[PDB]
């Protein structure tokens, strides 16, 4: 027993990381078959990064501008196109170590793992979630963008998000490995800021039944309530709505614990108002929201 | 720029996973040059898992006794020895995905990644320290002994731990992998318990320079103090002595943030005192200390 926030095992994509060099500018990049894929502004410099014109900015670009280096082998390319906020580099040879893989889209309150790269060598891993507004919690220095963040499923990698930038308050953005954004961001030196966070409800009880299932018992209760009142006191907390999916995703556990999701509620919302105030469940004095329900599951299963 | 409990790259350590089995006894070994190194009781049953004679048990087994796979090859062992509570068998083929590698002993206070893994199979990596009384707080259910602990220095894996067991408090047990205990516990099934637990001081004050060096600073106070008048305070909350060999270690991090190290003693016994007042540190709203300062620099700096 016990509960750890867990990465998946990084190997299958270690083999695919890469350093890409535009000038200036060095970033990671992801080998896959004979394509690398990275961060379109590694072609802007300090001066076009405060208004890019990214169309013509690459037009004027040739393959003999991209340096790829993996390891200490020199990768060669002999291609070049723009998907959305992503470069695709056509090199001459393919991954040997490409592992079975997609590209898939995450919503809100899912997790994944971040393989942080720095001159395209992996030097740590860990979990995030995407978070209600879009951004993630992570940790990223110059030179990470272009780090991953995938999920494995058997064999089979799914690629998420590909790392671009960093925001105000200490937390970041990306894209998918199509480009396209996670949340109303732009890939330019701008005033942005990440919305107001919410808290993910349903990981929330996901996380309570596993400090149930783990001997932490010292905030249940007798009392039921309903999704209404409860979503009511959500919103008053910046909480998500509890949907009456959320309810079913979390059935397994009400089951295997014997404790009613609508009595989880009225306990989570004893915890809203009175505050934890220094006390502890799970080793933690605040409610915890990045643990999925399967997250809770695969953990306490051994998959 | 954000501060994470980070673990280290796992894929040197998955190549080297693999399952052995003897009996009805299945968990994971280390598969390294020309020997697989696990638990020296997957020789037990239940029956012999009070008052084991490992030396009595080894002696009655031959080499075929003992299933090896790696993935789908079934590797042959040709030869074993026993060296304290770690197995070693001896196989026909090395291992070629085995890396640069040395095996070190860790003392308390230090941190390092386990790679959690079945039947041979890894199926996750986090971080941990080694607690003052000598056991981790891991994640490790049936079948997860012979998973081990370690750390990345460029392309040298160094590893340090070994699972064996689970403690009645929930928190976790095992050897180094010259198959020596960490602590005072031993690999049968008596009654046997951690001592009580304390916090890491030094590992405390690193995560509150991480805290300074990423831009806050409300907990910091305009107070010092002697580093014994710290220590009787410290004892109070039940927190490991400071030394001066911990205020050396913090040396770098003073000089970075041009807070000295008693300065930030005293901050430290200040948020003892009086908590967080709702406010939060590195996202945390408790003082975190399995981060130390050679974690600290890395991921900052
Ligand atoms: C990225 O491009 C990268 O890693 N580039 C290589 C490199 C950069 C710097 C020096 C050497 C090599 C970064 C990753 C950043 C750096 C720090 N933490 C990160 O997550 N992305 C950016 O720098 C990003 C560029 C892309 C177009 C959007 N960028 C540009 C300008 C400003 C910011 N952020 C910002 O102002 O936020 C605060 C919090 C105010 C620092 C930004 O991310
Ligand atoms: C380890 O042997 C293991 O993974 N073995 C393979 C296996 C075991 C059971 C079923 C299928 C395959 C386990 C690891 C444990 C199990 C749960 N979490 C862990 O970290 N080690 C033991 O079971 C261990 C072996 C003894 C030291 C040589 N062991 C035996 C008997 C009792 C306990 N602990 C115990 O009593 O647990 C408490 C917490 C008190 C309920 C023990 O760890």
Same mark, same amino acid.
């Given at each position: 027993?016990?509960?750890?926030?867990?990465?998946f095992? #990084?190997?299958?994509?270690?083999? *695919?990381m890469?350093?890409?060099?535009?000038?200036?500018?060095?970033?990671?990049?992801?080998?896959?078959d004979?394509?690398?894929? @990275?961060? %379109?502004?590694?072609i802007?410099?300090?001066?076009?990064?405060?208004?890019?014109?990214?169309?013509?900015?690459?037009?004027?670009?040739?393959?003999? !501008?991209?340096?790829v280096?993996?390891?200490? &082998?020199?990768?060669?390319?002999?291609?070049?196109?723009?998907?959305? *906020?992503?470069?695709?580099?056509?090199?001459?040879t +393919? !991954?040997?170590?490409?592992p079975?893989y997609?590209?898939?889209?995450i919503?809100?309150?899912?997790? =994944?793992? &971040?393989?942080? @790269?720095?001159?395209?060598?992996?030097?740590?891993?860990?979990?995030?979630?995407? %978070?209600p507004?879009?951004?993630?919690?992570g940790?990223?220095?110059?030179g990470?963008?272009? #780090?991953?963040?995938? !999920?494995i499923?058997?064999? *089979?990698?799914? =690629? *998420?998000?590909m790392?671009?930038?960093?925001l105000?308050?200490?937390?970041?953005?990306?894209?998918?490995?199509?480009?396209? =954004?996670?949340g109303?961001?732009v890939?330019?030196?701008?005033?942005?800021?990440?919305?107001?966070?919410?808290?993910?409800?349903?990981?929330?009880? +996901?996380?309570?039944?596993?400090?149930?299932?783990?001997?932490?018992?010292?905030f249940?209760?007798? =009392?039921?309530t309903?999704?209404?009142?409860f979503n009511?006191?959500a919103?008053?907390?910046?909480?998500?709505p509890?949907?009456?999916?959320? &309810?079913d995703?979390?059935?397994?556990?009400?089951?295997?614990?014997?404790?009613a999701?609508?009595?989880?509620? +009225?306990?989570?919302?004893?915890?809203?108002?009175?505050?934890?105030?220094? %006390?502890?469940?799970?080793?933690? +004095?605040?409610?915890?929201?990045?643990?999925?329900?399967?997250?809770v599951?695969?953990?306490?299963?051994?998959?």
């Open positions: 027993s016990g509960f750890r926030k867990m990465a095992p #990084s190997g299958k994509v270690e083999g *695919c890469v350093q890409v060099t535009c000038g200036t500018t060095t970033l990671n990049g992801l080998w896959l004979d394509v690398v894929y @990275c961060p %379109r502004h590694v802007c410099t300090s001066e076009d990064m405060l208004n890019p014109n990214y169309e013509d900015l690459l037009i004027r670009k040739s393959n003999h !501008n991209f340096l280096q993996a390891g200490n &082998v020199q990768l060669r390319v002999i291609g070049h196109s723009m998907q959305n *906020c992503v470069l695709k580099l056509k090199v001459d +393919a !991954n040997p170590k490409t079975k997609k590209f898939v889209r919503q809100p309150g899912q997790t =994944f793992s &971040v393989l942080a @790269c720095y001159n395209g060598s992996p030097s740590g891993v860990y979990q995030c979630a995407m %978070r507004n879009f951004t993630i919690k940790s990223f220095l110059n990470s963008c272009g #780090s991953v963040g995938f !999920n499923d058997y064999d *089979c990698v799914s =690629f *998420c998000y790392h671009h930038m960093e105000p308050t200490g937390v970041h953005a990306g894209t998918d490995l199509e480009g396209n =954004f996670y109303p961001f890939d330019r030196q701008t005033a942005q800021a990440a919305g107001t966070d919410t808290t993910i409800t349903v990981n929330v009880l +996901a996380w309570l039944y596993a400090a149930v299932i783990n001997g932490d018992r010292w249940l209760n007798r =009392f039921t309903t999704l209404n009142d009511l006191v919103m008053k907390y910046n909480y998500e509890l949907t009456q999916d959320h &309810v995703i979390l059935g397994p556990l009400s089951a295997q614990t014997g404790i999701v609508l009595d989880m509620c +009225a306990s989570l919302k004893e915890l809203l108002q009175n505050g934890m105030n220094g %006390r502890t469940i799970l080793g933690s +004095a605040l409610l915890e929201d990045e643990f999925t329900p399967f997250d599951v695969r953990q306490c299963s051994g998959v």
